[PDB]
Amino acid sequence: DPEKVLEQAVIDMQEDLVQLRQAVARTIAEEKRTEQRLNQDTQEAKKWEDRAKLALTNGEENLAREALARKKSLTDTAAAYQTQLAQQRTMSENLRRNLAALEAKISEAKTKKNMLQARAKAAKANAELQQTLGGLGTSSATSA
Amino acid sequence: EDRAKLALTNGEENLAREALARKKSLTDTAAAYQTQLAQQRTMSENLR
Amino acid sequence: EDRAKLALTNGEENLAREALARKKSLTDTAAAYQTQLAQQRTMSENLR
Amino acid sequence: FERMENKVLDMEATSQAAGELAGFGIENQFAQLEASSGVEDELAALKA
Protein backbone atom coordinates (compact mmCIF):
# COMPACT_ATOMS: atom_id res chain seq x y z
CA ASP A 1 0.00 0.00 0.00
CA PRO A 2 1.14 3.60 -0.54
CA GLU A 3 1.08 4.22 3.22
CA LYS A 4 3.78 1.62 3.89
CA VAL A 5 5.84 2.56 0.80
CA LEU A 6 6.05 6.32 1.65
CA GLU A 7 6.51 5.46 5.41
CA GLN A 8 9.59 3.31 4.51
CA ALA A 9 10.84 6.15 2.31
CA VAL A 10 10.64 8.54 5.27
CA ILE A 11 12.53 6.04 7.44
CA ASP A 12 15.25 5.67 4.80
CA MET A 13 15.52 9.46 4.63
CA GLN A 14 16.03 9.46 8.40
CA GLU A 15 19.15 7.36 7.80
CA ASP A 16 20.27 9.34 4.75
CA LEU A 17 20.32 12.65 6.64
CA VAL A 18 22.56 11.07 9.29
CA GLN A 19 24.86 9.69 6.59
CA LEU A 20 25.16 13.13 5.01
CA ARG A 21 25.87 14.64 8.43
CA GLN A 22 28.68 12.12 8.85
CA ALA A 23 30.05 13.05 5.42
CA VAL A 24 29.97 16.73 6.37
CA ALA A 25 31.84 15.95 9.58
CA ARG A 26 34.48 14.05 7.60
CA THR A 27 34.89 16.99 5.23
CA ILE A 28 35.25 19.37 8.18
CA ALA A 29 37.96 17.15 9.66
CA GLU A 30 39.81 16.96 6.34
CA GLU A 31 39.79 20.73 5.86
CA LYS A 32 40.98 21.26 9.43
CA ARG A 33 43.84 18.80 8.89
CA THR A 34 44.98 20.41 5.64
CA GLU A 35 44.75 23.87 7.24
CA GLN A 36 46.98 22.73 10.10
CA ARG A 37 49.45 21.13 7.69
CA LEU A 38 49.80 24.21 5.48
CA ASN A 39 49.96 26.46 8.57
CA GLN A 40 52.86 24.48 10.09
CA ASP A 41 54.63 24.19 6.72
CA THR A 42 54.60 27.98 6.39
CA GLN A 43 56.39 28.18 9.74
CA GLU A 44 58.91 25.51 8.75
CA ALA A 45 59.73 27.66 5.72
CA LYS A 46 60.39 30.63 8.00
CA LYS A 47 62.61 28.46 10.21
CA TRP A 48 64.66 27.42 7.19
CA GLU A 49 64.84 31.09 6.17
CA ASP A 50 66.26 31.82 9.62
CA ARG A 51 68.82 29.08 9.04
CA ALA A 52 69.63 30.81 5.75
CA LYS A 53 70.15 34.05 7.67
CA LEU A 54 72.50 32.23 10.05
CA ALA A 55 74.40 31.12 6.95
CA LEU A 56 74.44 34.73 5.73
CA THR A 57 76.15 35.59 9.02
CA ASN A 58 79.44 34.23 7.66
CA GLY A 59 80.68 31.73 5.10
CA GLU A 60 78.20 28.95 4.43
CA GLU A 61 76.63 30.19 1.20
CA ASN A 62 76.01 26.49 0.56
CA LEU A 63 73.90 26.38 3.72
CA ALA A 64 71.98 29.39 2.42
CA ARG A 65 71.26 27.64 -0.89
CA GLU A 66 70.21 24.47 0.93
CA ALA A 67 67.81 26.51 3.06
CA LEU A 68 66.49 28.13 -0.11
CA ALA A 69 65.83 24.67 -1.55
CA ARG A 70 63.98 23.71 1.63
CA LYS A 71 61.97 26.93 1.33
CA LYS A 72 61.06 26.15 -2.28
CA SER A 73 59.93 22.63 -1.40
CA LEU A 74 57.90 23.87 1.57
CA THR A 75 56.20 26.67 -0.38
CA ASP A 76 55.35 24.30 -3.24
CA THR A 77 53.83 21.87 -0.74
CA ALA A 78 51.93 24.75 0.88
CA ALA A 79 50.51 25.82 -2.48
CA ALA A 80 49.46 22.25 -3.25
CA TYR A 81 47.78 21.94 0.15
CA GLN A 82 46.07 25.30 -0.36
CA THR A 83 44.64 24.02 -3.64
CA GLN A 84 43.53 20.84 -1.87
CA LEU A 85 41.90 22.93 0.87
CA ALA A 86 40.07 24.95 -1.77
CA GLN A 87 38.76 21.71 -3.27
CA GLN A 88 37.69 20.48 0.17
CA ARG A 89 35.92 23.77 0.91
CA THR A 90 34.06 23.64 -2.41
CA MET A 91 33.02 20.04 -1.73
CA SER A 92 31.92 20.96 1.80
CA GLU A 93 29.75 23.81 0.53
CA ASN A 94 28.26 21.55 -2.13
CA LEU A 95 27.44 18.89 0.46
CA ARG A 96 26.02 21.51 2.84
CA ARG A 97 23.65 22.88 0.19
CA ASN A 98 22.72 19.33 -0.84
CA LEU A 99 21.96 18.51 2.80
CA ALA A 100 19.77 21.60 3.13
CA ALA A 101 17.85 20.68 -0.03
CA LEU A 102 17.51 17.04 1.02
CA GLU A 103 16.22 18.00 4.47
CA ALA A 104 13.66 20.31 2.88
CA LYS A 105 12.56 17.55 0.50
CA ILE A 106 12.28 14.99 3.30
CA SER A 107 10.30 17.27 5.61
CA GLU A 108 7.90 18.41 2.90
CA ALA A 109 7.35 14.91 1.53
CA LYS A 110 6.72 13.43 4.97
CA THR A 111 4.32 16.13 6.16
CA LYS A 112 2.44 16.36 2.86
CA LYS A 113 2.02 12.58 2.60
CA ASN A 114 0.86 12.36 6.22
CA MET A 115 -1.73 15.12 5.83
CA LEU A 116 -2.91 13.70 2.50
CA GLN A 117 -3.38 10.26 4.05
CA ALA A 118 -5.25 11.74 7.02
CA ARG A 119 -7.57 13.77 4.79
CA ALA A 120 -8.21 10.80 2.50
CA LYS A 121 -9.10 8.69 5.54
CA ALA A 122 -11.44 11.40 6.80
CA ALA A 123 -13.08 11.68 3.38
CA LYS A 124 -13.62 7.93 3.09
CA ALA A 125 -15.05 7.87 6.62
CA ASN A 126 -17.47 10.65 5.67
CA ALA A 127 -18.48 8.78 2.51
CA GLU A 128 -19.07 5.64 4.58
CA LEU A 129 -21.23 7.67 6.97
CA GLN A 130 -23.28 9.00 4.06
CA GLN A 131 -23.67 5.48 2.65
CA THR A 132 -24.85 4.18 6.03
CA LEU A 133 -27.33 7.05 6.25
CA GLY A 134 -28.60 6.02 2.82
CA GLY A 135 -28.13 2.33 3.62
CA LEU A 136 -30.60 2.12 6.51
CA GLY A 137 -32.40 -1.23 6.48
CA THR A 138 -35.12 -0.70 9.11
CA SER A 139 -37.65 -0.66 6.24
CA SER A 140 -37.56 -4.48 6.25
CA ALA A 141 -40.34 -4.42 8.86
CA THR A 142 -42.70 -3.84 5.93
CA SER A 143 -42.61 -7.63 5.55
CA ALA A 144 -44.04 -8.12 9.04
CA GLU B 1 8.43 37.92 10.69
CA ASP B 2 9.90 39.12 13.98
CA ARG B 3 13.12 37.32 13.08
CA ALA B 4 12.99 39.16 9.75
CA LYS B 5 12.67 42.44 11.67
CA LEU B 6 15.70 41.49 13.75
CA ALA B 7 17.52 40.97 10.45
CA LEU B 8 16.29 44.39 9.29
CA THR B 9 17.99 45.81 12.39
CA ASN B 10 21.37 45.52 10.67
CA GLY B 11 23.05 43.50 7.95
CA GLU B 12 21.52 40.07 7.51
CA GLU B 13 19.31 40.69 4.48
CA ASN B 14 19.82 36.97 3.85
CA LEU B 15 18.20 36.25 7.21
CA ALA B 16 15.30 38.49 6.17
CA ARG B 17 14.82 36.54 2.93
CA GLU B 18 15.03 33.23 4.80
CA ALA B 19 12.35 34.45 7.21
CA LEU B 20 10.26 35.52 4.22
CA ALA B 21 10.57 32.00 2.81
CA ARG B 22 9.46 30.57 6.15
CA LYS B 23 6.52 32.98 6.12
CA LYS B 24 5.52 31.89 2.61
CA SER B 25 5.66 28.21 3.55
CA LEU B 26 3.66 28.80 6.74
CA THR B 27 0.97 30.89 5.03
CA ASP B 28 0.61 28.32 2.24
CA THR B 29 0.21 25.58 4.84
CA ALA B 30 -2.31 27.74 6.71
CA ALA B 31 -4.35 28.26 3.53
CA ALA B 32 -4.29 24.52 2.82
CA TYR B 33 -5.42 23.76 6.37
CA GLN B 34 -8.14 26.41 6.10
CA THR B 35 -9.44 24.67 2.97
CA GLN B 36 -9.30 21.34 4.80
CA LEU B 37 -11.20 22.86 7.73
CA ALA B 38 -13.85 24.15 5.33
CA GLN B 39 -14.21 20.64 3.93
CA GLN B 40 -14.48 19.20 7.45
CA ARG B 41 -17.11 21.78 8.42
CA THR B 42 -19.17 21.01 5.32
CA MET B 43 -18.94 17.28 6.05
CA SER B 44 -19.89 17.87 9.69
CA GLU B 45 -22.97 19.87 8.70
CA ASN B 46 -23.95 17.20 6.17
CA LEU B 47 -23.62 14.47 8.80
CA ARG B 48 -25.53 16.56 11.35
CA GLU C 1 16.22 47.97 39.06
CA ASP C 2 17.69 49.11 42.38
CA ARG C 3 20.85 47.16 41.53
CA ALA C 4 20.85 49.01 38.20
CA LYS C 5 20.64 52.29 40.11
CA LEU C 6 23.60 51.21 42.24
CA ALA C 7 25.44 50.61 38.97
CA LEU C 8 24.38 54.08 37.79
CA THR C 9 26.09 55.42 40.91
CA ASN C 10 29.49 54.99 39.24
CA GLY C 11 31.12 52.89 36.55
CA GLU C 12 29.44 49.53 36.08
CA GLU C 13 27.30 50.25 33.02
CA ASN C 14 27.66 46.52 32.40
CA LEU C 15 25.95 45.87 35.73
CA ALA C 16 23.17 48.23 34.65
CA ARG C 17 22.66 46.31 31.41
CA GLU C 18 22.69 42.99 33.28
CA ALA C 19 20.03 44.33 35.64
CA LEU C 20 18.03 45.49 32.62
CA ALA C 21 18.21 41.96 31.21
CA ARG C 22 16.99 40.58 34.54
CA LYS C 23 14.16 43.12 34.46
CA LYS C 24 13.17 42.08 30.94
CA SER C 25 13.12 38.39 31.88
CA LEU C 26 11.11 39.07 35.03
CA THR C 27 8.54 41.28 33.29
CA ASP C 28 8.11 38.73 30.49
CA THR C 29 7.55 36.01 33.09
CA ALA C 30 5.10 38.28 34.92
CA ALA C 31 3.13 38.89 31.71
CA ALA C 32 3.03 35.15 31.00
CA TYR C 33 1.82 34.44 34.53
CA GLN C 34 -0.78 37.21 34.22
CA THR C 35 -2.10 35.54 31.07
CA GLN C 36 -2.14 32.20 32.90
CA LEU C 37 -4.01 33.80 35.80
CA ALA C 38 -6.57 35.21 33.36
CA GLN C 39 -7.07 31.72 31.96
CA GLN C 40 -7.45 30.29 35.47
CA ARG C 41 -9.97 32.99 36.40
CA THR C 42 -12.02 32.31 33.27
CA MET C 43 -11.97 28.57 34.00
CA SER C 44 -12.95 29.20 37.63
CA GLU C 45 -15.92 31.34 36.59
CA ASN C 46 -16.98 28.72 34.05
CA LEU C 47 -16.81 25.98 36.68
CA ARG C 48 -18.66 28.14 39.21
CA PHE D 1 55.04 12.94 20.48
CA GLU D 2 53.93 11.95 16.95
CA ARG D 3 51.14 9.75 18.45
CA MET D 4 49.99 12.76 20.60
CA GLU D 5 49.91 14.92 17.42
CA ASN D 6 47.67 12.39 15.66
CA LYS D 7 45.25 12.58 18.58
CA VAL D 8 45.29 16.38 18.29
CA LEU D 9 44.60 16.07 14.56
CA ASP D 10 41.64 13.82 15.35
CA MET D 11 40.38 16.51 17.73
CA GLU D 12 40.71 19.09 14.95
CA ALA D 13 38.82 16.80 12.57
CA THR D 14 36.03 16.50 15.14
CA SER D 15 36.03 20.30 15.43
CA GLN D 16 35.65 20.56 11.64
CA ALA D 17 32.81 18.03 11.68
CA ALA D 18 31.09 20.14 14.34
CA GLY D 19 31.71 23.35 12.40
CA GLU D 20 30.13 22.01 9.23
CA LEU D 21 26.99 21.61 11.36
CA ALA D 22 27.62 24.64 13.61
CA GLY D 23 25.56 26.90 11.34
CA PHE D 24 22.72 28.03 13.59
CA GLY D 25 20.21 30.84 13.83
CA ILE D 26 21.77 31.63 17.20
CA GLU D 27 23.85 34.08 15.15
CA ASN D 28 20.60 35.98 14.37
CA GLN D 29 19.63 35.45 18.07
CA PHE D 30 22.88 37.27 19.08
CA ALA D 31 21.55 40.40 17.24
CA GLN D 32 18.65 40.51 19.70
CA LEU D 33 21.15 40.38 22.57
CA GLU D 34 23.07 43.30 21.08
CA ALA D 35 19.82 45.23 20.61
CA SER D 36 18.92 44.63 24.26
CA SER D 37 22.38 45.81 25.29
CA GLY D 38 21.89 48.97 23.24
CA VAL D 39 18.48 49.50 24.84
CA GLU D 40 20.00 49.22 28.31
CA ASP D 41 22.74 51.65 27.28
CA GLU D 42 20.07 54.09 26.08
CA LEU D 43 18.23 53.72 29.39
CA ALA D 44 21.48 54.42 31.26
CA ALA D 45 21.99 57.52 29.11
CA LEU D 46 18.48 58.60 30.09
CA LYS D 47 19.43 58.15 33.75
CA ALA D 48 22.20 60.70 33.18
Swiss-Prot record, chain A:
<comment type="function">
    <text>Required for thylakoid formation.</text>
</comment>
<keyword id="KW-0175">Coiled coil</keyword>
<comment type="similarity">
    <text>Belongs to the PspA/Vipp/IM30 family.</text>
</comment>
<feature type="coiled-coil region">
    <location>
        <begin position="3"/>
        <end position="133"/>
    </location>
</feature>
<dbReference type="GO" id="GO:0005886">
    <property type="term" value="C:plasma membrane"/>
</dbReference>
<keyword id="KW-1003">Cell membrane</keyword>
<keyword id="KW-0997">Cell inner membrane</keyword>
<keyword id="KW-0472">Membrane</keyword>
<protein>
    <recommendedName>
        <fullName>Membrane-associated protein Vipp1</fullName>
    </recommendedName>
</protein>
Curated annotation (Swiss-Prot), chains B, C:
<protein>
    <recommendedName>
        <fullName>Membrane-associated protein Vipp1</fullName>
    </recommendedName>
</protein>
<comment type="function">
    <text>Required for thylakoid formation.</text>
</comment>
<comment type="similarity">
    <text>Belongs to the PspA/Vipp/IM30 family.</text>
</comment>
